[PDB]
């Protein structure tokens, strides 16, 4: 419950740091938030926000472990699970640089496990840099507008559109809709046209990604219709 219980190993990004718990040596991360400039109105919005995050237990959602206070630093520490595979943005960037497309089995895993993550988020009522990989091929959802759906521009189905954009980009190594301006971008999104994902990928994968990118939210598949898809098999699910 105190910072003294953990030892910082190193900075991941800037603050995000990799840490080891002294009691058992568990590898975790935490996030540094300086609330030394927040109002009592912001710290109230911050406290409740975190306590909802505490409530989300699911194998495909990044797991929360602890929150720590240090009045002397005015620093809030949010302690979470470490995903050693990194984020998906980096996987995508890695693929452009080395001119190598991702396996369809990888894409099916992401599709399957992010859909179960969304299904859990919808019961309690999305971009490559917010999706993490652990050490066992599991996919975990954590936490210029390429993925903005037409409706959220003019709804659970809005998340299906974002999922659709994410999977497309894993396949094509670029988003479905690109532009140099916002109006140009919004132009292309509303027209709903894009290249087929590369031919190395099956017609069946292309079909479901294209369905998620439908202009009509009511034409996009639901979480349940996605998991019914013959492409999706037990081995694409999470495993301890
Ligand atoms: C802001 C910087 N990052 C933020 C958070 C983060 N990263 C990891 N793992 C991990 C990351 C990179 C290389 C290798 C591993 N795990 C996390 N778990 C929660 N947040 C995490 C992503 C670039
Ligand atoms: Cl898991």
Curated annotation (Swiss-Prot):
Sequence positions bearing Phosphoserine: 149, 202
Amino-acid positions noted as binding ATP in the UniProt annotation, renumbered to this chain: 31
Catalytic reaction equation(s): L-seryl-[protein] + ATP = O-phospho-L-seryl-[protein] + ADP + H(+); L-threonyl-[protein] + ATP = O-phospho-L-threonyl-[protein] + ADP + H(+)
GO cellular component, as recorded: centrosome; ciliary basal body; cilium; condensed nuclear chromosome; cytoplasm; cytosol; intercellular bridge; kinetochore
Enzyme nomenclature, EC number: 2.7.11.1
Disease: Retinitis pigmentosa 67: A retinal dystrophy belonging to the group of pigmentary retinopathies. Retinitis pigmentosa is characterized by retinal pigment deposits visible on fundus examination and primary loss of rod photoreceptor cells followed by secondary loss of cone photoreceptors. Patients typically have night vision blindness and loss of midperipheral visual field. As their condition progresses, they lose their far peripheral visual field and eventually central vision as well.
Purpose of the protein: Protein kinase which is involved in the control of centrosome separation and bipolar spindle formation in mitotic cells and chromatin condensation in meiotic cells. Regulates centrosome separation (essential for the formation of bipolar spindles and high-fidelity chromosome separation) by phosphorylating centrosomal proteins such as CROCC, CEP250 and NINL, resulting in their displacement from the centrosomes. Regulates kinetochore microtubule attachment stability in mitosis via phosphorylation of NDC80.
Name assigned to this protein: Serine/threonine-protein kinase Nek2
Organism from which the protein derives: Homo sapiens
